[PDB]
């Protein structure tokens, strides 16, 4: 019962991340405004979820099979495109980019990218590196390439408009993001909070 053995505990689950909010007309004036979501895919980044509550009780993690999911809360009459991709290198910050087309293109260039209208649903797969490197579970520290295994950027390609042609300006909510994940934790512990 007092075993000093370490082993990966690969356990599965699902979680609710947050509700997206298409930026609309007013709040959309430049490129960086078109970045709705910048959410690290570190296990311990989603506070109340089960994944993070578990992560708090280990040192390390590694997404063996993760996939962000979009579930719309709108009709099919509204119109706006969305692009989503998970950059496996956190320190790649597109916010510095001004040219919007350059932004969408460096997004599409990432392999796991996805484009979808905010009236249907699609899945954003996380692509896993090939070296077996484990990542630390605690809050982000001096460097990020240790903790974060990826970063989910959600983009607004077009402008938001309604049944009629008038474009909305009220910055409404379109859907919700879920995470159907499979992770492997290595070292039992407790992280400070």
């Amino acid at each position: 019962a007092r075993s000093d053995v370490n082993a990966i505990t690969v356990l599965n689950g699902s979680d609710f991340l947050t509700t997206v909010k298409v930026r609309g007309s007013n709040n959309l004036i430049d490129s960086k405004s078109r970045i709705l979501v910048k959410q690290p895919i570190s296990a311990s980044s989603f506070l109340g979820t089960r994944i993070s509550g578990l992560s708090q009780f280990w040192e390390r993690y590694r997404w063996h099979k993760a996939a962000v999911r979009y579930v719309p809360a709108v009709p099919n009459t509204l119109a706006c495109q969305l692009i989503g991709y998970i950059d496996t290198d956190p320190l790649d910050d597109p916010n510095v980019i001004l040219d919007v087309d350059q932004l969408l293109r460096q997004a599409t260039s990432q392999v796991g990218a996805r484009q979808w209208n905010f009236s249907d649903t699609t899945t954003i797969p996380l692509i896993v590196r090939r070296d077996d490197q484990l990542y630390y579970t605690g809050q982000d520290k001096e460097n990020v390439r240790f903790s974060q295994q990826g970063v989910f950027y959600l983009l607004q390609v077009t402008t938001l408009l309604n049944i009629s042609g008038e474009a909305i300006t009220n910055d409404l909510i379109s859907g919700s993001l879920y995470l159907d994940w499979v992770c492997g934790f290595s070292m039992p512990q407790i992280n400070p909070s």
Binding site: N76, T77, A79, Q115, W116, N117, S119, D120
Partner: peptide, 21 residues
């Protein structure tokens, strides 16, 4: 007998909303 005098054809097509990609 005179065949195919005034032959008309019909082929219905749907027209959905929000063709998605």
């Amino acid at each position: 007998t005179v065949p195919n005098f005034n032959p008309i054809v019909a082929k219905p097509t749907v027209a959905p909303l929000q063709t998605n990609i």
